[PDB]
Amino acid sequence: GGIITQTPKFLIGQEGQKLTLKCQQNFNHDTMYWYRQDSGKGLRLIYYSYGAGSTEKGDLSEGYDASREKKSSFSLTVTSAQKNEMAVFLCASGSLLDVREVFFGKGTRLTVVEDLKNVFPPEVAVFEPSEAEISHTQKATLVCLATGFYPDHVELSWWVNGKEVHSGVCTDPQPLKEQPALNDSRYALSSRLRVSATFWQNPRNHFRCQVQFYGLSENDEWTQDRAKPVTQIVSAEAWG
Amino acid sequence: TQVEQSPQSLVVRQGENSVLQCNYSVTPDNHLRWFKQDTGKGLVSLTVLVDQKDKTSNGRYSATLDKDAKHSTLHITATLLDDTATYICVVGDRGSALGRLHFGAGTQLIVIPDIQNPDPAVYQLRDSKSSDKSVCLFTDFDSQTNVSQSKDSDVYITDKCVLDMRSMDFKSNSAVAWSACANAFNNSIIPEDTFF
Amino acid sequence: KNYTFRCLQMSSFANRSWSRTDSVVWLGDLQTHRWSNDSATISFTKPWSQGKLSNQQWEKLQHMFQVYRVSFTRDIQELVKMMSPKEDYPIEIQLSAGCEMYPGNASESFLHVAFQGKYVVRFWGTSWQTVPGAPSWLDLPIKVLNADQGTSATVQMLLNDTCPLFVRGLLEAGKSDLEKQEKPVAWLSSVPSSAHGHRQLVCHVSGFYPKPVWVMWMRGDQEQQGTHRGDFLPNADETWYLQATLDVEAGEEAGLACRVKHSSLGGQDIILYWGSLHHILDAQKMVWNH
Amino acid sequence: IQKTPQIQVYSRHPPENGKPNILNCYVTQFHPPHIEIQMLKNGKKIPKVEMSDMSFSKDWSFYILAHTEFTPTETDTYACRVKHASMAEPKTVYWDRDM
Ligand SMILES: *[C@@H]1O[C@H](CO)[C@@H](O[C@@H]2O[C@H](CO)[C@@H](O[C@@H]3O[C@H](CO)[C@@H](O[C@H]4O[C@H](CO)[C@@H](O)[C@H](O)[C@@H]4O)[C@H](O)[C@@H]3O)[C@H](O)[C@H]2NC(C)=O)[C@H](O)[C@H]1NC(C)=O
Ligand SMILES: *[C@@H]1O[C@H](CO)[C@@H](O[C@@H]2O[C@H](CO)[C@@H](O[C@@H]3O[C@H](CO)[C@@H](O)[C@H](O)[C@@H]3O)[C@H](O)[C@H]2NC(C)=O)[C@H](O)[C@H]1NC(C)=O
Ligand SMILES: *[C@@H]1O[C@H](CO)[C@@H](O[C@@H]2O[C@H](CO)[C@@H](O)[C@H](O)[C@H]2NC(C)=O)[C@H](O)[C@H]1NC(C)=O
């Protein structure tokens, strides 16, 4: 029928900051839900709604409020952000005449920070394969690194000849901390891409490594020296 | 918790079968349903079970339900690498929209690839922009071998990672270590026939 | 048509937090079951209340109903949420579910729901239905409840098969209490009338069972058409009370009698004469200062 | 709120002064079902007062029967006092043995 979409994908907030997250559905569902997923726990209902002006409390209703402006939109607002918490918020819409028709949003990821001074974008480098691997395997592995980014609000992608690729690609499932001893420490991420020797050997085959950083905006304005850690794409390139 | 999924984590060889299950105490037990939640994404429905003794099957996913035993099993046939995800079991306590869903904690599924022709080797990869920096990729290693994150601050190392060249039917594991080359992987119990 | 089996539910919702549901079950004019909001089990009020159901059969029903009560209470608490300005607390709901039992295999089943005192919904055939004159806003709650196919099946099972079966056994089991005969006991009294020099004659009839009785004022064979029968009032001991009045002019009392006809008497009609030896002597024992 | 209650006070058996009897108080036609019923002897509330289970006739209207063990006499007064939302002040109905 359509889609249930949450906004933002990722969210940065400071200790005590009142954050809000919108959810829009076009299914024409009367019932809408805001859930919170915690690692090692099931989805817990915060708030639900039967349509415009209705906001019914869940179990985790404390520290939050909802606002259903219209059938299409449900909006959750985190009353105050917790010290250095990390959370997932999930939006779902449901048919009032079919209990079994439930559609879910792709989730919003929250990260609370000490000071926005800690927010840094990644630095992306592509490593050309080993002449040693081509003479042995006849397979070329382009490697990529995304280092010094905070939070882990990233989206890595490989691009050959202008088109995005998934075959031969592998990205790290979890990122590596820089200084794990300190809280709010910068992150590292690695991603391999494998192509046939014959393909890589050609210097007419272009290889691009894209990384989408989800940082700051006009809202979330600072007063620091070095360039704003805004949302951006930092991508590396190679030919062979 | 009223809905309990078992086991917390499950490891399966690629091309094999996967059997994850859930027992519940929710009452009434109108319907049970399974979702697949892809790493960092939302929930996707796989199947809905409604009868006292129901069996339903969507594609490669199959499921059963004994509402008397208050038990339901999920069956993944021919486990692909794309099946690596958390599987969430939910119970609806009513038939009308007056009901409420009860969610299990999930079962994290990990599908080990079938490395048919190993060739363990670690190569040095020069940076695209200049001479420095350098990185070392330990690859083509068997399903059996495991990567260890060393204690040292200077060298940072990642865990085993599968890639797949689809128009090759080829699959290879990998690990990456950065700043020394041959020493990068010493804390991990590497195979003896590793090329250098 | 002879006996009607009724399961009466009375649910009161004062607000979001406070609720209570109480039930009583009637086979004709005799109660068979009682279910308090504080009792988690259906209580028998006659020794034959289980009917001809086995202990496991009965337990399966009691558990069914146990689960239902908690489900119903919440479903209404949710429908107030959904029906936000159209309706709100305090809410009052009544349910009448049962059988009207006729000779042979003949039976008609019913499930009627009253909202705030008025009858608005009935379960008819395989679905919930509003009845003529129901508020329009009930359309969404019905469309919502009729979405549940399990309840429909559970209910269809009860009304069609379980209730008639149950009550057929209930009738055999309780035959001794249902077919009982209790003799009425009559006594006369009198009070002034609204009008001047006019008296009202009260003829009290009490303790009879079954309910059908005939109580008339006579003057020979001459039935006094002025007689005004009261409404059947119950006694604590599952018997009945009724009183017949007659408005007379002072002095017209001599010759009048109160005639009572009942099945327990067996053709031996009670004739109570105004001013009879017994009347005088019974009146002496019932004197007061008004 | 909706319907105002109807109190009938009758005895079980013909009343004989000094001879023990049963007083019944039949309360009907009220709505909502929340109601307070007390039987009183000489103003003072009668302690052990038994109550039937609240039920409702085919016309959906409620009915409840209060009854107590009592001994009628010439001087003693018996009444049934009802508190219901529909009424401003409680309704006290006296047992009149002649009607
Ligand atoms: C009609 O019947 C229903 C079922 O019989 C009643 O509903 C249940 O009512 C009970 C009691 O009100 C509810 O449970 C309570 O839960 C409390 C905790 O959430 C308990 O509190 C205890 O602990 C606190 C400390 O945390 C103490 O301070 C306190 O003193 C107490 O010891 C309660 O003791 C109790 O368990 C229950 O959830 C209700 N169940 C359902 C299915 O709704 C209903 O009230 C009855 N109505 C009336 C008016 O009688
Ligand atoms: C319980 O008893 C009720 C009767 O009160 C049953 O309802 C009736 O069931 C039939 C199906 O068996 C219904 O379907 C059909 O209706 C169409 C017209 O709409 C007609 O052409 C068909 O011949 C057939 O009758 C019927 O509508 C329905 N009757 C009423 C009054 O609604 C119910 O199915 C029984 N359930 C069980 C479990 O025994
Ligand atoms: C919900 O309704 C009940 C009953 O009307 C309320 O309970 C009453 O609470 C007051 C004090 O707040 C007492 O004086 C009454 O005796 C209580 N009644 C009963 C029957 O226990 C309850 O307060 C209401 N809740 C809200 C939120 O208003």
PDB file of C-alpha atoms in Angstrom, chain C residues 150-259:
ATOM      1  CA  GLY C 150     -12.571 -16.252  17.779  1.00  0.00           C
ATOM      2  CA  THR C 151     -15.068 -14.556  20.070  1.00  0.00           C
ATOM      3  CA  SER C 152     -17.738 -15.021  17.379  1.00  0.00           C
ATOM      4  CA  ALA C 153     -17.008 -18.815  17.264  1.00  0.00           C
ATOM      5  CA  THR C 154     -16.814 -19.054  21.123  1.00  0.00           C
ATOM      6  CA  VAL C 155     -20.162 -17.169  21.471  1.00  0.00           C
ATOM      7  CA  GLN C 156     -21.866 -19.149  18.594  1.00  0.00           C
ATOM      8  CA  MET C 157     -20.789 -22.329  20.472  1.00  0.00           C
ATOM      9  CA  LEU C 158     -22.402 -21.173  23.718  1.00  0.00           C
ATOM     10  CA  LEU C 159     -25.738 -19.804  22.425  1.00  0.00           C
ATOM     11  CA  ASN C 160     -26.364 -22.559  19.818  1.00  0.00           C
ATOM     12  CA  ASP C 161     -25.026 -25.724  21.512  1.00  0.00           C
ATOM     13  CA  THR C 162     -23.743 -25.178  25.145  1.00  0.00           C
ATOM     14  CA  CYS C 163     -26.581 -23.049  26.714  1.00  0.00           C
ATOM     15  CA  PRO C 164     -29.485 -25.338  25.429  1.00  0.00           C
ATOM     16  CA  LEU C 165     -27.531 -28.504  26.434  1.00  0.00           C
ATOM     17  CA  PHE C 166     -26.616 -27.051  29.857  1.00  0.00           C
ATOM     18  CA  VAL C 167     -30.151 -25.825  30.729  1.00  0.00           C
ATOM     19  CA  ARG C 168     -31.736 -29.185  29.513  1.00  0.00           C
ATOM     20  CA  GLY C 169     -29.618 -30.957  32.158  1.00  0.00           C
ATOM     21  CA  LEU C 170     -30.276 -28.108  34.635  1.00  0.00           C
ATOM     22  CA  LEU C 171     -34.023 -28.808  34.260  1.00  0.00           C
ATOM     23  CA  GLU C 172     -33.699 -32.608  35.010  1.00  0.00           C
ATOM     24  CA  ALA C 173     -31.278 -31.935  37.978  1.00  0.00           C
ATOM     25  CA  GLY C 174     -33.478 -29.302  39.645  1.00  0.00           C
ATOM     26  CA  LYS C 175     -36.903 -30.891  38.975  1.00  0.00           C
ATOM     27  CA  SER C 176     -37.700 -31.181  42.744  1.00  0.00           C
ATOM     28  CA  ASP C 177     -37.130 -27.401  43.338  1.00  0.00           C
ATOM     29  CA  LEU C 178     -38.610 -26.242  40.021  1.00  0.00           C
ATOM     30  CA  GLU C 179     -41.898 -28.232  40.356  1.00  0.00           C
ATOM     31  CA  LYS C 180     -42.425 -27.274  44.051  1.00  0.00           C
ATOM     32  CA  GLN C 181     -45.777 -26.183  45.526  1.00  0.00           C
ATOM     33  CA  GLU C 182     -45.972 -23.609  48.300  1.00  0.00           C
ATOM     34  CA  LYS C 183     -49.362 -22.694  49.803  1.00  0.00           C
ATOM     35  CA  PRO C 184     -50.169 -18.958  50.088  1.00  0.00           C
ATOM     36  CA  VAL C 185     -51.255 -17.471  53.467  1.00  0.00           C
ATOM     37  CA  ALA C 186     -53.760 -14.671  53.327  1.00  0.00           C
ATOM     38  CA  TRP C 187     -54.749 -11.945  55.760  1.00  0.00           C
ATOM     39  CA  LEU C 188     -56.937  -8.819  55.509  1.00  0.00           C
ATOM     40  CA  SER C 189     -56.247  -5.208  56.661  1.00  0.00           C
ATOM     41  CA  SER C 190     -57.796  -1.763  55.946  1.00  0.00           C
ATOM     42  CA  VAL C 191     -56.864   1.952  55.589  1.00  0.00           C
ATOM     43  CA  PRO C 192     -58.809   5.218  54.923  1.00  0.00           C
ATOM     44  CA  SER C 193     -59.243   6.390  51.300  1.00  0.00           C
ATOM     45  CA  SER C 194     -58.376   9.702  49.662  1.00  0.00           C
ATOM     46  CA  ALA C 195     -62.170  10.394  49.564  1.00  0.00           C
ATOM     47  CA  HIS C 196     -64.193  11.182  52.696  1.00  0.00           C
ATOM     48  CA  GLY C 197     -65.962   8.245  54.459  1.00  0.00           C
ATOM     49  CA  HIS C 198     -64.278   5.724  52.159  1.00  0.00           C
ATOM     50  CA  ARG C 199     -62.069   2.704  53.089  1.00  0.00           C
ATOM     51  CA  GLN C 200     -59.459   0.704  51.176  1.00  0.00           C
ATOM     52  CA  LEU C 201     -59.418  -3.047  51.875  1.00  0.00           C
ATOM     53  CA  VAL C 202     -56.104  -4.833  51.605  1.00  0.00           C
ATOM     54  CA  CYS C 203     -55.963  -8.580  51.074  1.00  0.00           C
ATOM     55  CA  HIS C 204     -52.425  -9.874  51.632  1.00  0.00           C
ATOM     56  CA  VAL C 205     -51.307 -13.090  49.971  1.00  0.00           C
ATOM     57  CA  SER C 206     -47.820 -14.428  50.854  1.00  0.00           C
ATOM     58  CA  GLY C 207     -45.573 -17.492  50.627  1.00  0.00           C
ATOM     59  CA  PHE C 208     -46.948 -19.039  47.448  1.00  0.00           C
ATOM     60  CA  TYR C 209     -44.916 -20.763  44.715  1.00  0.00           C
ATOM     61  CA  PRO C 210     -45.103 -21.018  41.647  1.00  0.00           C
ATOM     62  CA  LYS C 211     -45.878 -17.408  40.693  1.00  0.00           C
ATOM     63  CA  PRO C 212     -49.420 -17.812  39.008  1.00  0.00           C
ATOM     64  CA  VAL C 213     -52.177 -16.882  41.567  1.00  0.00           C
ATOM     65  CA  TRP C 214     -55.754 -15.450  41.377  1.00  0.00           C
ATOM     66  CA  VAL C 215     -56.792 -13.015  44.157  1.00  0.00           C
ATOM     67  CA  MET C 216     -60.208 -11.430  44.010  1.00  0.00           C
ATOM     68  CA  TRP C 217     -62.654  -9.511  46.228  1.00  0.00           C
ATOM     69  CA  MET C 218     -66.149 -11.193  46.289  1.00  0.00           C
ATOM     70  CA  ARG C 219     -69.675 -10.564  47.574  1.00  0.00           C
ATOM     71  CA  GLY C 220     -71.101 -14.028  47.135  1.00  0.00           C
ATOM     72  CA  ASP C 221     -70.323 -15.267  43.603  1.00  0.00           C
ATOM     73  CA  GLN C 222     -70.103 -11.595  42.560  1.00  0.00           C
ATOM     74  CA  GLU C 223     -66.431 -10.751  41.719  1.00  0.00           C
ATOM     75  CA  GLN C 224     -65.814  -7.067  42.745  1.00  0.00           C
ATOM     76  CA  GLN C 225     -64.510  -5.571  39.471  1.00  0.00           C
ATOM     77  CA  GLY C 226     -62.987  -2.705  41.549  1.00  0.00           C
ATOM     78  CA  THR C 227     -60.199  -5.004  42.803  1.00  0.00           C
ATOM     79  CA  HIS C 228     -56.703  -3.671  42.049  1.00  0.00           C
ATOM     80  CA  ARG C 229     -53.979  -6.374  42.157  1.00  0.00           C
ATOM     81  CA  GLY C 230     -50.551  -5.196  43.248  1.00  0.00           C
ATOM     82  CA  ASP C 231     -47.248  -6.155  41.654  1.00  0.00           C
ATOM     83  CA  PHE C 232     -45.696  -9.539  42.592  1.00  0.00           C
ATOM     84  CA  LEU C 233     -42.992  -8.778  45.244  1.00  0.00           C
ATOM     85  CA  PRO C 234     -40.497 -11.507  46.248  1.00  0.00           C
ATOM     86  CA  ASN C 235     -39.825 -12.947  49.692  1.00  0.00           C
ATOM     87  CA  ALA C 236     -36.311 -13.914  50.847  1.00  0.00           C
ATOM     88  CA  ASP C 237     -37.209 -17.674  50.836  1.00  0.00           C
ATOM     89  CA  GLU C 238     -37.810 -17.787  47.034  1.00  0.00           C
ATOM     90  CA  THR C 239     -41.661 -17.367  47.438  1.00  0.00           C
ATOM     91  CA  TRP C 240     -44.005 -14.545  46.477  1.00  0.00           C
ATOM     92  CA  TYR C 241     -46.128 -11.763  47.966  1.00  0.00           C
ATOM     93  CA  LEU C 242     -49.097 -10.005  46.336  1.00  0.00           C
ATOM     94  CA  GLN C 243     -51.869  -7.848  47.677  1.00  0.00           C
ATOM     95  CA  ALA C 244     -55.340  -7.096  46.237  1.00  0.00           C
ATOM     96  CA  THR C 245     -57.195  -3.875  47.225  1.00  0.00           C
ATOM     97  CA  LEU C 246     -60.837  -2.770  47.108  1.00  0.00           C
ATOM     98  CA  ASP C 247     -62.230   0.705  47.681  1.00  0.00           C
ATOM     99  CA  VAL C 248     -65.475   0.631  49.603  1.00  0.00           C
ATOM    100  CA  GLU C 249     -67.825   3.040  51.408  1.00  0.00           C
ATOM    101  CA  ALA C 250     -67.979   2.597  55.201  1.00  0.00           C
ATOM    102  CA  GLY C 251     -70.423  -0.249  55.961  1.00  0.00           C
ATOM    103  CA  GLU C 252     -70.043  -2.013  52.617  1.00  0.00           C
ATOM    104  CA  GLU C 253     -67.380  -4.240  54.226  1.00  0.00           C
ATOM    105  CA  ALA C 254     -69.891  -6.754  55.678  1.00  0.00           C
ATOM    106  CA  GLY C 255     -70.363  -9.623  53.185  1.00  0.00           C
ATOM    107  CA  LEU C 256     -67.139  -9.035  51.309  1.00  0.00           C
ATOM    108  CA  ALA C 257     -64.505 -11.790  51.179  1.00  0.00           C
ATOM    109  CA  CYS C 258     -61.125 -12.209  49.599  1.00  0.00           C
ATOM    110  CA  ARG C 259     -60.929 -15.313  47.368  1.00  0.00           C
TER     111      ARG C 259
END
